[PDB]
Amino acid sequence: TMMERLHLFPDEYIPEDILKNLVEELPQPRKIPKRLDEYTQEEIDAFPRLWTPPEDYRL
Amino acid sequence: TARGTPSRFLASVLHNGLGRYVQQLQRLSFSVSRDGASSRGAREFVEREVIDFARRNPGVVIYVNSRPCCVPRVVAEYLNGAVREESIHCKSVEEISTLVQKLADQSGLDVIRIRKPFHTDNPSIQGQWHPFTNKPTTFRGLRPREVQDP
Amino acid sequence: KSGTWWDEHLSEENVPFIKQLVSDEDKAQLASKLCPLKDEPWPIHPWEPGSFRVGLIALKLGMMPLWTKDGQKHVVTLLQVQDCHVLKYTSKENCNGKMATLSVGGKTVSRFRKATSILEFYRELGLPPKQTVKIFNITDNAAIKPGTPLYAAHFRPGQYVDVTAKTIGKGFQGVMKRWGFKGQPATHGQTKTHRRPGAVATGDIGRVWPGTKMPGKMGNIYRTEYGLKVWRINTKHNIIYVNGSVPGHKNCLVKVKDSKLPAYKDLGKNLPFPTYFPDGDEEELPEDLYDENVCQPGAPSITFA
Amino acid sequence: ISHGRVFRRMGLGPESRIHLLRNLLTGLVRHERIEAPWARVDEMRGYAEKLIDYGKLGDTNERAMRMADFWLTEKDLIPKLFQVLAPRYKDQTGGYTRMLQIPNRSLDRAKMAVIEYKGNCLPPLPLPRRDSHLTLLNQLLQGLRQDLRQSQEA
Amino acid sequence: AAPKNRRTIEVNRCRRRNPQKLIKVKNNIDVCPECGHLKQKHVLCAYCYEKVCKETAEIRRQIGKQEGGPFKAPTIETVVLYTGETPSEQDQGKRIIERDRKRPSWFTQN
RNA sequence: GCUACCUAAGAACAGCUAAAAGAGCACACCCGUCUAUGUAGCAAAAUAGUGGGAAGAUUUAUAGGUAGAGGCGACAAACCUA
RNA sequence: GUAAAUUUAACUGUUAGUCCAAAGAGGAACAGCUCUUUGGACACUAGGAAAAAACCUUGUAGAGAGAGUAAAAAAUUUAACA
RNA sequence: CUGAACUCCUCACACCCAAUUGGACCAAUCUAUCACCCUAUAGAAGAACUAAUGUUAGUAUAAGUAACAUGAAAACAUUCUC
RNA sequence: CUCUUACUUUUAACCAGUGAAAUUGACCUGCCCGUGAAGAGGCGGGCAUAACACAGCAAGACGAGAAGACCCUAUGGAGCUUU
RNA sequence: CUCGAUGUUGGAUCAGGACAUCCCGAUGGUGCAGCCGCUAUUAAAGGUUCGUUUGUUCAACGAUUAAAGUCCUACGUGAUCUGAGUUCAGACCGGAGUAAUCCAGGUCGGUUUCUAUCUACUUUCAAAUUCCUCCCUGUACGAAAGGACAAGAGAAAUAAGGCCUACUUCACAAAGCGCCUUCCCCCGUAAAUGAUAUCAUCUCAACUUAGUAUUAUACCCACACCCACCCAAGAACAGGGUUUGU
Ligand code: MET
Ligand SMILES: [K+]
Ligand SMILES: [K+]
Ligand SMILES: [K+]
Ligand SMILES: [K+]
Ligand SMILES: [K+]
Ligand SMILES: [K+]
Ligand SMILES: [K+]
Ligand SMILES: [K+]
Ligand SMILES: [K+]
Ligand SMILES: [Mg+2]
Ligand SMILES: [Mg+2]
Ligand SMILES: [Mg+2]
Ligand SMILES: [Mg+2]
Ligand SMILES: [Mg+2]
Ligand SMILES: [Mg+2]
Ligand SMILES: [Mg+2]
Ligand SMILES: [Mg+2]
Ligand SMILES: [Mg+2]
Ligand SMILES: [Mg+2]
Ligand SMILES: [Mg+2]
Ligand SMILES: [Mg+2]
Ligand SMILES: [Mg+2]
Ligand SMILES: [Mg+2]
Ligand SMILES: [Mg+2]
Ligand SMILES: [Mg+2]
Ligand SMILES: [Mg+2]
Ligand SMILES: [Mg+2]
Ligand SMILES: [Mg+2]
Ligand SMILES: [Mg+2]
Ligand SMILES: [Mg+2]
Ligand SMILES: [Mg+2]
Ligand SMILES: [Mg+2]
Ligand SMILES: [Mg+2]
Ligand SMILES: [Mg+2]
Ligand SMILES: [Mg+2]
Ligand SMILES: [Mg+2]
Ligand SMILES: [Mg+2]
Ligand SMILES: [Mg+2]
Ligand SMILES: [Mg+2]
Ligand SMILES: [Mg+2]
Ligand SMILES: [Mg+2]
Ligand SMILES: [Mg+2]
Ligand SMILES: [Mg+2]
Ligand SMILES: [Mg+2]
Ligand SMILES: [Mg+2]
Ligand SMILES: [Mg+2]
Ligand SMILES: [Mg+2]
Ligand SMILES: [Mg+2]
Ligand SMILES: [Mg+2]
Ligand SMILES: [Mg+2]
Ligand SMILES: [Mg+2]
Ligand SMILES: [Mg+2]
Ligand SMILES: [Mg+2]
Ligand SMILES: [Mg+2]
Ligand SMILES: [Mg+2]
Ligand SMILES: [Mg+2]
Ligand SMILES: [Mg+2]
Ligand SMILES: [Mg+2]
Numbered sequence A: 001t002m003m004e005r006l007h008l009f010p011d012e013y014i015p016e017d018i019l020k021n022l023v024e025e026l027p028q029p030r031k032i033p034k035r036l037d038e039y040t041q042e043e044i045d046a047f048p049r050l051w052t053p054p055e056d057y058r059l
Numbered sequence B: 001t002a003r004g005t006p007s008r009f010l011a012s013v014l015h016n017g018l019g020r021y022v023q024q025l026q027r028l029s030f031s032v033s034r035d036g037a038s039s040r041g042a043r044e045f046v047e048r049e050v051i052d053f054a055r056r057n058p059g060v061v062i063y064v065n066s067r068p069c070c071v072p073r074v075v076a077e078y079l080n081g082a083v084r085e086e087s088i089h090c091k092s093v094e095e096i097s098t099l100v101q102k103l104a105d106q107s108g109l110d111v112i113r114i115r116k117p118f119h120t121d122n123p124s125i126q127g128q129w130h131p132f133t134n135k136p137t138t139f140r141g142l143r144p145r146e147v148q149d150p
Numbered sequence C: 001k002s003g004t005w006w007d008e009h010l011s012e013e014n015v016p017f018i019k020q021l022v023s024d025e026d027k028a029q030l031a032s033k034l035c036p037l038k039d040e041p042w043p044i045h046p047w048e049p050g051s052f053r054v055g056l057i058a059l060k061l062g063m064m065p066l067w068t069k070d071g072q073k074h075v076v077t078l079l080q081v082q083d084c085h086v087l088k089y090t091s092k093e094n095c096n097g098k099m100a101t102l103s104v105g106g107k108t109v110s111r112f113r114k115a116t117s118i119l120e121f122y123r124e125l126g127l128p129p130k131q132t133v134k135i136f137n138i139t140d141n142a143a144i145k146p147g148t149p150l151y152a153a154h155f156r157p158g159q160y161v162d163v164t165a166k167t168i169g170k171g172f173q174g175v176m177k178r179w180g181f182k183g184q185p186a187t188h189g190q191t192k193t194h195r196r197p198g199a200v201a202t203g204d205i206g207r208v209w210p211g212t213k214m215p216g217k218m219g220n221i222y223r224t225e226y227g228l229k230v231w232r233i234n235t236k237h238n239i240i241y242v243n244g245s246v247p248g249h250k251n252c253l254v255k256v257k258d259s260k261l262p263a264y265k266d267l268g269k270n271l272p273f274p275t276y277f278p279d280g281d282e283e284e285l286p287e288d289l290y291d292e293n294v295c296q297p298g299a300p301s302i303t304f305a
Numbered sequence D: 001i002s003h004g005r006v007f008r009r010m011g012l013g014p015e016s017r018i019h020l021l022r023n024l025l026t027g028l029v030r031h032e033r034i035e036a037p038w039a040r041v042d043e044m045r046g047y048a049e050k051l052i053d054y055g056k057l058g059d060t061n062e063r064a065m066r067m068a069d070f071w072l073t074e075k076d077l078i079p080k081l082f083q084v085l086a087p088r089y090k091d092q093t094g095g096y097t098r099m100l101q102i103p104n105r106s107l108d109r110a111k112m113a114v115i116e117y118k119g120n121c122l123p124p125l126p127l128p129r130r131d132s133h134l135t136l137l138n139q140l141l142q143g144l145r146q147d148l149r150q151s152q153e154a
Numbered sequence E: 001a002a003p004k005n006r007r008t009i010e011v012n013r014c015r016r017r018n019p020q021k022l023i024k025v026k027n028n029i030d031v032c033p034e035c036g037h038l039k040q041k042h043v044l045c046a047y048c049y050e051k052v053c054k055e056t057a058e059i060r061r062q063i064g065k066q067e068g069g070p071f072k073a074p075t076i077e078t079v080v081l082y083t084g085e086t087p088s089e090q091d092q093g094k095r096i097i098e099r100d101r102k103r104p105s106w107f108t109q110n
Numbered sequence F: 001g002c003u004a005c006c007u008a009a010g011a012a013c014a015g016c017u018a019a020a021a022g023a024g025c026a027c028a029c030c031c032g033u034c035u036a037u038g039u040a041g042c043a044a045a046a047u048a049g050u051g052g053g054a055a056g057a058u059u060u061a062u063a064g065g066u067a068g069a070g071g072c073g074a075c076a077a078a079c080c081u082a
Numbered sequence G: 001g002u003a004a005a006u007u008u009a010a011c012u013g014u015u016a017g018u019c020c021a022a023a024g025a026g027g028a029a030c031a032g033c034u035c036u037u038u039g040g041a042c043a044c045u046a047g048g049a050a051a052a053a054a055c056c057u058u059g060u061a062g063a064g065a066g067a068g069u070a071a072a073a074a075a076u077u078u079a080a081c082a
Numbered sequence H: 001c002u003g004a005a006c007u008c009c010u011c012a013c014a015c016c017c018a019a020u021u022g023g024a025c026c027a028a029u030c031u032a033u034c035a036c037c038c039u040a041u042a043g044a045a046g047a048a049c050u051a052a053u054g055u056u057a058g059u060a061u062a063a064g065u066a067a068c069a070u071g072a073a074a075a076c077a078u079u080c081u082c
Numbered sequence I: 001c002u003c004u005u006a007c008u009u010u011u012a013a014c015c016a017g018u019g020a021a022a023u024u025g026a027c028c029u030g031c032c033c034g035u036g037a038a039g040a041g042g043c044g045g046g047c048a049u050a051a052c053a054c055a056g057c058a059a060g061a062c063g064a065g066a067a068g069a070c071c072c073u074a075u076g077g078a079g080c081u082u083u
Numbered sequence J: 001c002u003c004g005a006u007g008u009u010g011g012a013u014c015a016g017g018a019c020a021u022c023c024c025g026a027u028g029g030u031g032c033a034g035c036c037g038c039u040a041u042u043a044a045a046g047g048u049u050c051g052u053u054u055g056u057u058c059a060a061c062g063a064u065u066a067a068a069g070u071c072c073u074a075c076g077u078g079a080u081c082u083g084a085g086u087u088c089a090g091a092c093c094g095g096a097g098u099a100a101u102c103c104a105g106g107u108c109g110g111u112u113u114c115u116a117u118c119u120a121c122u123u124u125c126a127a128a129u130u131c132c133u134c135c136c137u138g139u140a141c142g143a144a145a146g147g148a149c150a151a152g153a154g155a156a157a158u159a160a161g162g163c164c165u166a167c168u169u170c171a172c173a174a175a176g177c178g179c180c181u182u183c184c185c186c187c188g189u190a191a192a193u194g195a196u197a198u199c200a201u202c203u204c205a206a207c208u209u210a211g212u213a214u215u216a217u218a219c220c221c222a223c224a225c226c227c228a229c230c231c232a233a234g235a236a237c238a239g240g241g242u243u244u245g246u
């Protein structure tokens, strides 16, 4: 019976009837880490450089 | 067992004890034997105990009938209409007095299982819990994933 | 509350009249569909790779031998198309599946032995009810308007088709006939054990595994024969000559569809699409279409030289 | 697998089946109306129809006389077949007998049927009759039939 | 093999009172128009068939009296006549069976 | 009164071969080899078929005899009222 | 520190033993093996180790729709080379 | 933090071991004497049955299962089949 | 037998009549793995799961039947043999 | 644990499972030229013969085969069967014993019951495996002898599912000895590019390829005429037909 109250959808699509009776959105249990390119320039500038690479290194 | 017997909730008669206390015992009918050996304690109770007991309970009418009987009995009738018959067969005067006093203190309701050891007509003062008691409201009451002014 | 039939309360005079009345109406309804292309046909798209067309429903007349030009003998089954019409078309969205479906019926039967819901379904369609209805999965470009008649020229010689029908039911049968078990010897002491299954499981499990071969109903189930070559087509009597045997007894209704085997994929380029329309055909087809290797009855005797 | 089997399995075997039908057939010819279990009457009905066909061949036909000799255990019925029953159905090409179901036998509750030769002297069986043409349903259909004929002529 | 345990009445009631084992109500029962007694639609009326058989038995007894022994089947047709009736033109040359009663209404003369 | 053996006095054994027969083929009859069925069965030992013997140490009716520390036994520790 | 002990009078039952820890013997430094010794538990309660006679926690009995606890959950991831 | 019948809390307290042993009560029956809508004090004894493949009787279960039976027509005269 | 098949009779199944027996602690009587007096429908962890007839099957219910005939035990018997 | 019973060999029947793989598939190494082998990794979908002797499991032998796998399942399965063996009562021989009697010594004979109450089950998948021939080719390889693989073509066997035109057992039909149809993948490794470690390095580094399928598709799919009759449907029930209801 409890499973009959559980509704699963693979994607962002939800039926209109299911959407119209929603009440509260529970917070996601896990905080999604941001990729390297998602950091703003202020955050990148905030984090200090830790080492000085040699000037003659090819990298 | 509890499943094989009836049950009820804790209650009183006419909300007894709220405005005033009314003794629920209404009538006691004794049946003693003049010559019966099993009625020896019953005769002792009538000689010295029932007269003083009647003084302390002016609201209870006590009927003592002396007739031949093998098993003396006392019948207690209450205001709510319940009738309880108890045997005083071969009981001492002290045991009869304890039994009679026990009948006077009872409310007359059925002596069966009581589901809850408490009763209240107003269990809540601040408001009974509902799923929205601790849920904050949102602006314009928008549901999750709802678009306003499409 | 008592049950009734169509001619329970009819008088002596009325029974011949009612039979004539309904029979004439059925012939008129069938004759009204003889020109599908003059009654606003649906668009006819050219055949494309990956497109699946509709099949037919045919009645198994019997089997007949034929000989090829190399002298080999091939026995073929005659499948006659009898009153085959497209009944209902369901869109891809509404089919609940991966392809659109086309419903096909055949072998017009009496209206007096059909359900009211079925009778009113055919009343709107304007056709007499069909005995058997089969569902064919087709692509969007192969859609055909309901009520369009279907003929045995829908298939052509050299094509491979699949035939599906209910097999001959043999009732409750033992393991020896149903599953081909070896049974027990007839002599040397056997005591009331000659056709019995024997052991049905091992002692450790303490149970019979699901799907264990046991006596029971045999036959009377749908089976499909794949890769049946079409040798001959009779356009006059609407008869399809399919290679080998097909499931089911004679005079049974079968489901004929283009073969699903990978070797025969995308061989519908030269086949009619979405079907065959005799009314719109420029030149009337000959009475019998023969495969290139089939010895026609009027052909001379085979000479190896 | 009794697919295509048209002959019932009755009696003690194949020969006993013929003798059981022959006794019923012999009784049918003499009395022109007999009652028996429904299955046996239905099995015997086919033979009764073909017996009259042999009677139409005439008593001068050796084959017809031999067939009548075997199936009529009482030899007084052989003249009856070729001189009463066969001339009776001279103008009929079939339907010599009518078979109707009667209530079940009292003893073993067996399904019983009555079979007779048409045109006998016995009182008629309570044949089932269709509804009269004057009933409400038949009157409506008669009016429909008249309308179609009038339109066809026009 | 023998039962491992006794089957209870609760189990037995479910099997015995199952609708497959219960008697089915018949719907093909109708009143015979001739006599008013009940009959089935595909079955001849019991009252009327007995009426015909009673008259048939009387006629067959009269046939035996005229034949007067076994193997006496006539080679001519048979006509049954009742009181107050005379042979017709089409009945000449046929064996005549006489019944000492008035002709039944349902037995139409031919 | 079953059965083992015995006593008195009875009965039965077609046909064919050989004609001599504890001889052969083969009914009645006696027995019970093999197989199937049956296993609360028709039967507390049977049915169906196939078999052994069938003028002899044969089979069998009637009455009698031997009794348990025993009888009886062409020894199977058989049989002596399942 | 504790409250038992011996003696006198009168009897019954038990006298076919299991695992764990420990010191040993037999076997094979096998056994849910066999035989002794010291102690525990079981053949009585309850909780725990999943289910669980023998390990752990805990025992003296009733009612309560109070409370504090006892034992009580498995951790671990590795091969370059002058 | 959860967690016992451990311990505390309100009230009460003889009220959780086999064999065995001690003790307090008691159903029904008969008798003495009471009692007189079913009892009392004593004396007595064929004095208490969820179990012995227990005895007898009733009735289930398997089970409406296994199994059992009447050649055919007909005027019940008779005839027919084998 | 390779390698079975067809038909008939009996049985069978259905209808009507009559009506047994062994058996039976109670049963509201599933599967897998684990556990356990060492081989679980009933215990643990999972899985499966509207209800109820009829006909088949013989893997299990350590199936029914016979207080194991084998083995050992009993200061329990008996038959037979004997220096 | 079971002696108030848990029935023993081997066979028949039906097989379930394990992989420590006999055959078929994919790979690494070789004292791998090729053809045949040896060894190791991976793979349990499929298959794994017929006979003489023996009660046999085995074993020996004959003829084959791509191969005639190893084990578990109460030494799988006797309320399915067999009873040759083994294992009662008869008897014989050798041997032991004064005898009774005995001998994992041989030998002949020797009753295999059960009407299914419960559980379980009674159409899972409708994708197929393998050999041989021709061809490649007398090519690759090799001193010679010898002798492939891949691709392609054809014909069979088995298994699964059907069918009756002929043949055949047969004859309104059921059958095989007859005919018809039968479709995807298998992961072990072999290679690039390139870091830790500026070379290199197929990478439990990020990554690329052989290299993969939401196993594709197919089948099934509507519903009181229904008293009755018929049926290629069927034990009953159900199902199909009756516009073939004198
Ligand atoms: C061993 O053989 C034992 N089962 C005895 C068999 S005869 C009763
Ligand atoms: K008998
Ligand atoms: K005597
Ligand atoms: K055959
Ligand atoms: K079983
Ligand atoms: K045992
Ligand atoms: K395998
Ligand atoms: K042998
Ligand atoms: K069960
Ligand atoms: K590296
Ligand atoms: Mg069938
Ligand atoms: Mg066989
Ligand atoms: Mg035998
Ligand atoms: Mg037997
Ligand atoms: Mg047999
Ligand atoms: Mg088991
Ligand atoms: Mg049939
Ligand atoms: Mg019969
Ligand atoms: Mg003498
Ligand atoms: Mg003689
Ligand atoms: Mg002689
Ligand atoms: Mg005799
Ligand atoms: Mg003798
Ligand atoms: Mg002789
Ligand atoms: Mg004497
Ligand atoms: Mg003798
Ligand atoms: Mg001897
Ligand atoms: Mg002996
Ligand atoms: Mg003592
Ligand atoms: Mg031990
Ligand atoms: Mg100890
Ligand atoms: Mg003990
Ligand atoms: Mg626990
Ligand atoms: Mg305590
Ligand atoms: Mg707590
Ligand atoms: Mg407490
Ligand atoms: Mg206490
Ligand atoms: Mg009392
Ligand atoms: Mg007393
Ligand atoms: Mg007593
Ligand atoms: Mg009792
Ligand atoms: Mg008892
Ligand atoms: Mg009953
Ligand atoms: Mg019955
Ligand atoms: Mg039964
Ligand atoms: Mg029966
Ligand atoms: Mg019989
Ligand atoms: Mg009979
Ligand atoms: Mg049966
Ligand atoms: Mg009984
Ligand atoms: Mg009993
Ligand atoms: Mg339930
Ligand atoms: Mg259940
Ligand atoms: Mg288990
Ligand atoms: Mg469970
Ligand atoms: Mg069943
Ligand atoms: Mg048993
Ligand atoms: Mg068993
Ligand atoms: Mg015993």
Ligand SMILES: [Mg+2]
Binding pocket: none
């Ligand atoms: Mg012994």
Ligand SMILES: [Mg+2]
Binding pocket: I072, I073
């Ligand atoms: Mg002993």
Ligand SMILES: [Mg+2]
Binding pocket: I075
């Ligand atoms: Mg002793």
Ligand SMILES: [Mg+2]
Binding pocket: none
């Ligand atoms: Mg003694």
Ligand SMILES: [Mg+2]
Binding pocket: none
């Ligand atoms: Mg038992």
Ligand SMILES: [Mg+2]
Binding pocket: none
């Ligand atoms: Mg085997």
Ligand SMILES: [Mg+2]
Binding pocket: J015
């Ligand atoms: Mg297998």
Ligand SMILES: [Mg+2]
Binding pocket: none
């Ligand atoms: Mg491996």
Ligand SMILES: [Mg+2]
Binding pocket: none
């Ligand atoms: Mg592996």
Ligand SMILES: [Mg+2]
Binding pocket: J024, J046
């Ligand atoms: Mg393979």
Ligand SMILES: [Mg+2]
Binding pocket: J032
């Ligand atoms: Mg290599």
Ligand SMILES: [Mg+2]
Binding pocket: J075
């Ligand atoms: Mg075994």
Ligand SMILES: [Mg+2]
Binding pocket: none
């Ligand atoms: Mg078994």
Ligand SMILES: [Mg+2]
Binding pocket: J078
């Ligand atoms: Mg065996």
Ligand SMILES: [Mg+2]
Binding pocket: none
């Ligand atoms: Mg033997």
Ligand SMILES: [Mg+2]
Binding pocket: none
């Ligand atoms: Mg000797």
